Amino acid sequence: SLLNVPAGKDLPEDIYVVIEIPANADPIKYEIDKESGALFVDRFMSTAMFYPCNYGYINHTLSLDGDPVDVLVPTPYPLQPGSVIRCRPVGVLKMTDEAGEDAKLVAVPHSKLSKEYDHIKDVNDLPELLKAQIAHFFEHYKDLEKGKWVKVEGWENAEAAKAEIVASFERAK
Amino acid sequence: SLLNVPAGKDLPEDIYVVIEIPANADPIKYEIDKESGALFVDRFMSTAMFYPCNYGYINHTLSLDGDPVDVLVPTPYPLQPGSVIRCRPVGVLKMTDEAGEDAKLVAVPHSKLSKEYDHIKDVNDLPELLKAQIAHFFEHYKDLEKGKWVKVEGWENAEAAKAEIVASFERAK
Amino acid sequence: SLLNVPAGKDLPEDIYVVIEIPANADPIKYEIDKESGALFVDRFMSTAMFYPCNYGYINHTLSLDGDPVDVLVPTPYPLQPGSVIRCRPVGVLKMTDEAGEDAKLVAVPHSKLSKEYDHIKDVNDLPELLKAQIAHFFEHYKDLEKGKWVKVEGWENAEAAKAEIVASFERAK
Amino acid sequence: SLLNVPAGKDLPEDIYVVIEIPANADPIKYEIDKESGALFVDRFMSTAMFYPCNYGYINHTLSLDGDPVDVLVPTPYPLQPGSVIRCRPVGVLKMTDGEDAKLVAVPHSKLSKEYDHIKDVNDLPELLKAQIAHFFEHYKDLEWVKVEGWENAEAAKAEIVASFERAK
Amino acid sequence: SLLNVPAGKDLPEDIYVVIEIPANADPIKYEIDKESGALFVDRFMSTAMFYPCNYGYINHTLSLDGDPVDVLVPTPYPLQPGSVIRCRPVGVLKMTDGEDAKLVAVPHSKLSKEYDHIKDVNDLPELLKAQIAHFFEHYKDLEWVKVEGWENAEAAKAEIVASFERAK
Amino acid sequence: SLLNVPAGKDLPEDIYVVIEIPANADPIKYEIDKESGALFVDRFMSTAMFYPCNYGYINHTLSLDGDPVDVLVPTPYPLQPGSVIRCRPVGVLKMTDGEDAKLVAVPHSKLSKEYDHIKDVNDLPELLKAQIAHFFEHYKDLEWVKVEGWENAEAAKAEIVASFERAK
**What is the homologous superfamily of the domain C1-173 according to CATH?**
Inorganic pyrophosphatase (3.90.80.10)
Chain F nearest-CA residue for D4: F36
Q: Give which of E121, E113, E123 is closest to E156, Cα–Cα.
A: E121
Q: Give which of D152, D149, D138, D158 is closest to D94, Cα–Cα.
A: D149
CB atoms within 10 A of CB C170: 11
Neighbours of chain B (3+ CB pairs under 8 A): A, C, D, E
d(CA C77, CA B116): 32
Q: Give which of E23, E91, E24, E84 is closest to E58, Cα–Cα.
A: E84
Distance, in angstroms, between F99 CA and closest chain A CA? Answer: 32
Q: Degrees (nearest 5) of the Cα angle C127, C129, C131?
A: 75
Can you say which residues of B are annotated as belonging to the binding site for Mg(2+)? 65, 70, 102
d(CA B6, CA E22): 39
Which E-chain residues 17-36 have CB contacts (< 8 A) with chain A? 24, 26
Q: Name the CATH architecture for the domain at F1-168.
A: Alpha-Beta Complex (3.90)
CB contact under 8 A, D49 and B51: no
Nearest by CB to A129, from F114, F125, F127: name it: F114
d(CA B54, CA B56): 7
Do the chains C and D touch each other, judged by at least 3 C-beta pairs below 8 angstroms?
yes
Distances from the Cα of A143 to the Cαs of A97, E90, E133, E162, in angstroms?
Answer: 12, 26, 11, 35
Query: Is D25 in contact with E80 (CB distance < 8 Å)?
Result: no
Omega before D12 within 30 of 0, i.e. cis: yes
Could you tell me which residues come within 8 angstroms of residue C85 by beta carbon, excluding any fewer than 6 positions away? B40, B41, C16, C17, C19, C54, C56, C73, C75, C79, C109, C113
Query: Is D130 in contact with D121 (CB distance < 8 Å)?
Result: no
Query: Is C87 in contact with C75 (CB distance < 8 Å)?
Result: no
CB contact under 8 A, B35 and C4: yes
Omega before A109 within 30 of 0, i.e. cis: no
Residue D123 assigned ligand-binding role: no
Residue D43 assigned ligand-binding role: yes
d(CA B111, CA B116): 8
Rg over CA atoms, chain B: 15
E strand or H helix that includes residue A168: helix A158-171
CB contact under 8 A, D48 and B46: no
CB pairs under 8 A between A and F: 6
DSSP D58-124: -TT---TTSSPPEEEE--SSPPPTTEEEEEEEEEEEEEE--EEEEEEEEE-TTT-STTTT--SGGGS
Do the chains F and D touch each other, judged by at least 3 C-beta pairs below 8 angstroms?
yes
d(CA F18, CA D92): 37
Could you tell me which residues come within 8 angstroms of residue E146 by beta carbon, excluding any fewer than 6 positions away? E95, E96, E97, E137
Do the chains B and E touch each other, judged by at least 3 C-beta pairs below 8 angstroms?
yes
Which amino acid belongs to residue B159? E
d(CA F137, CA F151): 17
d(CA F153, CA C95): 42
Contacts of F28 in chain D (CB under 8 A): 75, 77, 79
Could you tell me which residues come within 8 angstroms of residue A18 by beta carbon, excluding any fewer than 6 positions away? A2, A5, A32, A56, A57, A58, A59, A82, A83, A84, C38
Determine the straight-line distance between the first and last CA of chain F, rounded to whole angstroms: 19
Q: Assign D155 to helix, strand or coil.
A: helix
Could you tell me which residues come within 8 angstroms of residue C4 by beta carbon, excluding any fewer than 6 positions away? B35, B36, B38
Query: Is C11 in contact with C172 (CB distance < 8 Å)?
Result: no
DSSP code of residue C26: -
Query: What is the pairing mode between strands F83-96 and E39-44?
Result: parallel
Contacts of A37 in chain B (CB under 8 A): 1
Q: Give which of D109, D54, D111 is closest to D78, Cα–Cα.
A: D54
Please give the resolution of this entry in Å, rounded to 1 decimal: 2.2
Q: Give which of D79, D82, D62 is closest to D70, Cα–Cα.
A: D62
d(CA C56, CA D1): 47
d(CA B103, CA B92): 6
Which amino acid belongs to residue D97? D
Could you tell me which residues come within 8 angstroms of residue F66 by beta carbon, excluding any fewer than 6 positions away? none
CB contact under 8 A, F111 and E1: no
CB atoms within 10 A of CB B14: 15
Distance, in angstroms, between D35 CA and closest chain E CA? Answer: 9
Determine the straight-line distance between the first and last CA of chain C, rounded to whole angstroms: 20
Contacts of B82 in chain A (CB under 8 A): 38-39, 82
Could you tell me which residues come within 8 angstroms of residue B104 by beta carbon, excluding any fewer than 6 positions away? B70, B71, B72, B92, B93, B95, B138
Q: Assign D164 to helix, strand or coil.
A: helix
Distances from the Cα of F149 to the Cαs of C22, C48, F94, in angstroms?
Answer: 34, 19, 5
d(CA A33, CA B42): 26
d(CA A56, CA A42): 13
Which A-chain residues 152-171 have CB contacts (< 8 A) with chain E? none
Query: Is E63 in contact with E69 (CB distance < 8 Å)?
Result: yes
Query: Is C164 in contact with C63 (CB distance < 8 Å)?
Result: yes
Chain F nearest-CA residue for C26: F24
Query: Is A165 in contact with A107 (CB distance < 8 Å)?
Result: no
CB contact under 8 A, A129 and E46: yes
Contacts of C131 in chain F (CB under 8 A): none
E strand or H helix that includes residue C129: helix C128-140
Contacts of D2 in chain E (CB under 8 A): 1
Could you tell me which residues come within 8 angstroms of residue E99 by beta carbon, excluding any fewer than 6 positions away? none
Could you tell me which residues are beta bridge partners of residue B107? B89
Distance, in angstroms, between D77 CA and closest chain C CA? Answer: 11
Q: Assign A102 to helix, strand or coil.
A: strand
Q: Give which of E114, F11, B115 is closest to D43, Cα–Cα.
A: E114
Nearest by CB to D112, from F38, F40, F43: name it: F43
Dihedral (Cα; B128, B132, B133, B135), 10-degree rounding: 140
Distance, in angstroms, between C54 CA and closest chain D CA? Answer: 16
Query: Is D108 in contact with D140 (CB distance < 8 Å)?
Result: no
DSSP code of residue A133: H
CB contact under 8 A, F40 and D78: no
Chain B nearest-CA residue for A37: B1
Could you tell me which residues come within 8 angstroms of residue F19 by beta carbon, excluding any fewer than 6 positions away? F54, F55, F56, F73, F79, F80, F81, F82, F83, F84, F85
Distances from the Cα of A36 to the Cαs of B1, B5, B19, B88, in angstroms?
Answer: 5, 6, 15, 21
Do the chains A and F touch each other, judged by at least 3 C-beta pairs below 8 angstroms?
yes
Q: Which of A130, A136, A138, A139 to mutate to test the interface with E (most CBs of E within 10 A)?
A: A136
Q: Give which of F128, F55, F66 is closest to F100, Cα–Cα.
A: F66
Per-residue three-class SS string for chain B: CHHHCCCCCECCCEEEEEEEECCCCCCEEEEECCCCCCEEEEEECCCCECCCCEEEECCCCCCCCCCCCEEEECCCCCCCCCEEEEEEEEEEEEEEECCEEEEEEEEEECCCCCCCCCCCCCHHHCCHHHHHHHHHHHHHCCCCCCCCCEEEEEEECHHHHHHHHHHHHHHCC
d(CA E79, CA E22): 5
Distances from the Cα of E167 to the Cαs of D63, E18, E41, E62, E162, in angstroms?
Answer: 39, 17, 25, 5, 8
Phi and psi at residue F101, in whole multiples of 5°? Answer: -140, 140
Neighbours of chain D (3+ CB pairs under 8 A): B, C, E, F
d(CA D74, CA D57): 14
Q: For chain B, say whether A81 makes contact (Cβ under 8 Å).
A: yes
Q: Assign E1 to helix, strand or coil.
A: coil
Name the burial class of residue B76, with classes exposed (0-12), middle (13-18) and buried (19+) by CB atoms within 10 angstroms of its CB: middle
Distance, in angstroms, between A145 CA and closest chain E CA? Answer: 11
Could you tell me which residues come within 8 angstroms of residue A138 by beta carbon, excluding any fewer than 6 positions away? A93, A95, A104, A150, A152
Strand locations in A22-82, DSSP E? Answer: 28-32, 39-44, 54-57, 70-73
d(CA E147, CA A143): 15
Which C-chain residues 94-153 have CB contacts (< 8 A) with chain D? 115-116, 127, 129
Query: Is A50 in contact with E49 (CB distance < 8 Å)?
Result: yes
Q: Assign E57 to helix, strand or coil.
A: strand
Could you tell me which residues come within 8 angstroms of residue B5 by beta carbon, excluding any fewer than 6 positions away? A33, A36, A38, B16, B18, B59, B84
Q: Give which of A73, A42, A43 is closest to A55, Cα–Cα.
A: A73
Strand locations in F35-125, DSSP E? Answer: 39-44, 54-57, 70-73, 83-96, 99-107
Distances from the Cα of E106 to the Cαs of B129, B142, E103, E132, F168, in angstroms?
Answer: 17, 35, 10, 14, 48
Query: What is the pairing mode between strands B70-73 and E146-151?
Result: unpaired
The domains of chain C are located at: 1-173
Name the burial class of residue F66, with classes exposed (0-12), middle (13-18) and buried (19+) by CB atoms within 10 angstroms of its CB: exposed
d(CA C13, CA C107): 10
Contacts of D85 in chain F (CB under 8 A): 40-41
Nearest by CB to C1, from B1, B27, B82: name it: B1
Q: Assign A118 to helix, strand or coil.
A: coil
Chain B nearest-CA residue for D141: B136
E strand or H helix that includes residue D17: strand D15-21
CB atoms within 10 A of CB F42: 18
Query: Is C8 in contact with C15 (CB distance < 8 Å)?
Result: yes
Q: Give which of B97, B77, B71 is closest to B17, Cα–Cα.
A: B71
Could you tell me which residues come within 8 angstroms of residue D82 by beta carbon, excluding any fewer than 6 positions away? D2, D18, D19, D20, D32, D39, E82, F38, F39, F82
Q: How was this structure determined?
A: X-ray
Q: Degrees (nearest 5) of the Cα angle A170, B1, B7?
A: 115
Distances from the Cα of C70 to the Cαs of C31, C60, C78, in angstroms?
Answer: 11, 12, 17
Q: For chain C, say whether B64 makes contact (Cβ under 8 Å).
A: no
Nearest by CB to E39, from F82, F110, F112: name it: F82
Query: What is the pairing mode between strands C28-32 and C39-44?
Result: antiparallel
Contacts of A129 in chain F (CB under 8 A): 113-114
Residue F57 assigned ligand-binding role: no
Query: Is F78 in contact with F26 (CB distance < 8 Å)?
Result: no
Strand locations in chain E, DSSP E? Answer: 15-21, 28-32, 39-44, 54-57, 70-73, 83-96, 99-107, 146-151
Dihedral (Cα; A81, A86, A87, A88), 10-degree rounding: 130
Dihedral (Cα; C157, C160, C165, C167), 10-degree rounding: 180
Q: Give which of A113, A76, A72 is closest to A89, Cα–Cα.
A: A72
DSSP alpha helices (H): ranges in chain E? 126-138, 153-167
Q: For chain F, say whether C48 makes contact (Cβ under 8 Å).
A: yes
Q: Assign D4 to helix, strand or coil.
A: helix
Which amino acid belongs to residue A15? I
d(CA B7, CA B168): 11
CB atoms within 10 A of CB B33: 17
